Ligand binder design. Structure first.
Ligand code: ZN
Ligand code: ZN
Lengths: 180, 180
């Protein structure tokens, strides 16, 4: 519907970039993912930054059972991150974990960028990634991660610290969720 | 996006009806509208049950300035509710006031039902009201309320207490917001 909340969240996100506080966030860990999430949803979602205690789904696809989150989250964390493919593989798992009640996609995309920034010196130019193509690649990722790999690989940038490049990407990241 | 939060809110709405707690929500008042909202969004929205202190919009349409909410809310609450037309006019004002950050549509639709129940012993068969027709009528409502008045008048029921009917109704209400 109107998604008024998300308008406010987008502003928190922008604030996160503009203030330089994003450099302060721990990278590649679930703590770091929680930090991102808290920043984006604090004051909006009661569970901002909190691991869910309920099960969630898209269609007939259940995300990781909250029963196992304590086990699988550290296991994802421990995955290697030495190249592009490994990092995308780690991202695909973290998305399957989908550890929050809402806002997994936009928090985890930032998380991914930080991981690519740290290890590869790259980020994803989300605004060059069409929404339908992104969603369909994500939907296929649990079974075949080739689509999402190819799609992210086509659109890396070395322009890793430029505030407006980053803000354009976050704007698109929120557009993926329906905010136009 | 996935709207996991909304699925969780749907279960809370169902529970509100099924448990019979709905029978002691105060009818036709701001406090009552807040009770509804609190109940649907508690533990989901940080702001569950609270009047917003920010401005919100759809397109270039701003809902009532949060600067005036303290003044217009009591004025809306004072509006007559003796017949169908009055109750709908009251509802239309209440939607324009849009006093919460998010979840105005679902809370206020329930609020409408309770008013119609108290006053005319009817409820709206939401599941028989197409979503495009509903959205178009609401969009036109600030300027001309005939569309919404006509649409609602055609899908009223005397069966105000059947919880199957009520659940079908609330499921459709959530569907209006994009929950599928
Ligand atoms: Zn709204
Ligand atoms: Zn999701």
């Amino acid at each position: 519907g109107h998604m008024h909340l998300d308008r406010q969240s987008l502003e928190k996100a922008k604030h996160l970039i503009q203030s330089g506080l994003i450099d302060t966030i721990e990278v590649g860990t679930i703590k770091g993912l929680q930090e991102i999430h808290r920043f984006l949803f604090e004051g909006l979602y009661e569970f901002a930054g909190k691991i869910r205690d309920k099960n969630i789904a898209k269609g007939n696809f259940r995300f990781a059972n909250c029963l196992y989150l304590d086990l699988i989250l550290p296991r994802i964390e421990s995955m290697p991150q030495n190249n592009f493919n490994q990092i995308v593989e780690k991202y695909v798992e973290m998305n399957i974990a989908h550890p929050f009640l809402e806002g997994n996609g936009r928090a985890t995309r930032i998380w991914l960028d930080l991981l690519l920034k740290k290890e590869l010196k790259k980020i994803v130019l989300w605004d060059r990634i069409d929404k339908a193509a992104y969603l369909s690649a994500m939907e296929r990722s649990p079974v075949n991660d080739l689509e999402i790999k190819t799609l992210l690989k086509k659109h890396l940038s070395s322009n890793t610290n430029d505030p407006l490049t980053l803000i354009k990407g976050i704007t698109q990241s929120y557009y993926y969720e329906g905010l136009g």
